Amino acid sequence: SQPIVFYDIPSNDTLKQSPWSPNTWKIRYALNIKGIKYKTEWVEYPDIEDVVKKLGGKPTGKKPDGRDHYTVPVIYDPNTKTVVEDGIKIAKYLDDAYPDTPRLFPAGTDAFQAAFDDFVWSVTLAFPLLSLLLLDVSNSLPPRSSAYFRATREQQFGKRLEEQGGEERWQQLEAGLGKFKGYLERNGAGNDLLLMGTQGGITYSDVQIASLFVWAKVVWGEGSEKWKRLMGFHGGKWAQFCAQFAEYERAD
Amino acid sequence: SQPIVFYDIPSNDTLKQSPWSPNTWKIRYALNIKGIKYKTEWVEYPDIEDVVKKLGGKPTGKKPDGRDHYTVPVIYDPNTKTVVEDGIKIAKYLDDAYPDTPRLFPAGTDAFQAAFDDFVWSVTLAFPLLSLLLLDVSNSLPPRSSAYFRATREQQFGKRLEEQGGEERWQQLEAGLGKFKGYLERNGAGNDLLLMGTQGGITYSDVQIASLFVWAKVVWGEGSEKWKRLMGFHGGKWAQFCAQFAEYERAD
């Protein structure tokens, strides 16, 4: 059985070309947790539209110009001759097409995890963290990608990148992560480190959060002041949380 | 074994004193689905804080004045001499203390359902519908409660009640309800009428939506233009959704 081709966006020498994207990382984690064979195909931001089209992939949405929006993660599975785009579809595909690998969407959790998906990618939690990372990401891309990144994101938010971030958002972040700590604590003590209990296994929804963190960790650097601050939060719960995902970090 | 005392806010003769609140209804449903014996204690909006204090209950949050905020639903269980406040705590309590009754929080769904809670009570879905009901609710209350309701809610949003609502919100409502339809549809055909599939049973999270709808139905009236419009949405999916809850409507 052949390796799955996995399209990821690369980084420059300041990150040792470690993968960084919180969106592709949720599928890298999927692959690693599931132990399915894959090889990374690196693609630059400006080249994603053409690469995914030439590949026969579908766009994951529309831009405000009504123009097709093509994104990564994306996968080509030789073993089934299919091309899956859109991270939460790709993860379920890895469930359906490889049923003897750990299930990221346990039975009946399918709609709950979809709801949780809107919680993550929202002004509550991912966007604050984005703002803290928008600039450092620009400086962590190869030149062509970095240029595309700065242009498009600056347009997207009306600000320069250097205007983004600051303490207003470090609070919003702590607040969102707090809300999440809240939800987890409803699982009761001893179960407050995975959405379905530190008993009933890792889910895609867990992986989504793990991915926000690994993204921060890679771009700021395990030693940075920013990373250590974030691990500061909530008595270091997120340190304990991220540890569960340590064995699943295989940059390739 | 003795009836649970269940505090709900009453309505005037225009609703035949049917209970109406979408917050108390989710616990009414819980009790009816679980077939646990209860009797309703009616309490007026302005008398809630004192009733719950004289009862030994805790407030469920803070007002912006930092002043304690006491709310219903609330229950007193004679059989265990305890007083639970806060809807989602009350529902879990009815799980824990009555384990041979249908479980509203199936194992490991605890945090997922807590995340869903924030989905429901948000500008996405519950608030748009609130704006469509704020006025008719005020006209549906006993005079003392109606007065308190109009006062406090007008202060809360900075508009008169009569300024609230309109098409802008009927769209937001259709949109949020669409987003729900989307989540459900991830369960696959034949499973898209309950969060855990029309197979794996009714959850508290399901009940929360059913309660928004019964609220609308009671206040507007099963015959109203508004109610029929709402049932119009998404090809009448919500009609099908609501039917699952019909046998659990016991005003008392």
Numbering used by the authors:
A (entry chain A), B (entry chain B): 2 to 253
Give the text the authors published on this PDB structure.
Glutathione transferases (GSTs; EC 2.5.1.18) constitute a large superfamily of multifunctional enzymes that are involved in phase II of xenobiotic detoxification by catalyzing the conjugation of glutathione (GSH) to a variety of electrophilic compounds. Most of the GSTs are dimeric proteins, each monomer harbouring two domains : a thioredoxin N-terminal domain containing the conserved GSH binding site (G site) and a more variable C-terminal α-helical domain (H site) usually involved in the binding of the GSH acceptor compound. The fungal specific class GSTFuA is particularly concerned by this expansion. As assumed in our recent report PcGSTFuA2, PcGSTFuA3 and PcGSTFuA1 share the same structure, which contains distinctive features when compared with canonical GST structure: (i) a new mode of dimerization, (ii) an original β-hairpin (β2’β2’’) that inhibits the formation of the regular GST dimer and acts as a lid over the G-site and (iii) a supplementary helix (α4’), between helices α4 and α5, that closes the presumed H-site.
PcGSTFuA2 crystallized in the space group C2221 with three dimers in the asymmetric unit. Global NCS restraints were imposed during refinement because diffraction limit of the crystals was 3.2 Å. Structural superpositions of apo/holo PcGSTFuA1, PcGSTFuA2 and PcGSTFuA3 unambiguously showed that PcGSTFuA2 and PcGSTFuA3 are in the holo conformation in the conditions used. The observed holo conformations can be explained by the presence of crystallization agent molecules in the G sites, which mimic some of the interactions formed by bound GSH. In the structure of PcGSTFuA2, a citrate molecule mimics the binding of GSH glycyl moiety. The citrate ion stabilization involves the main chains of Tyr-71 and Val-73 and the side-chains of Tyr-46, His-70 and Arg-154. The distance plot, which compares superposed structures of holo PcGSTFuA1 and PcGSTFuA2, reveals no big differences. The largest is localized in the center of the helix α4 where a residue is inserted in PcGSTFuA2 sequence. This difference results in a disruption in the continuity of helix α4.
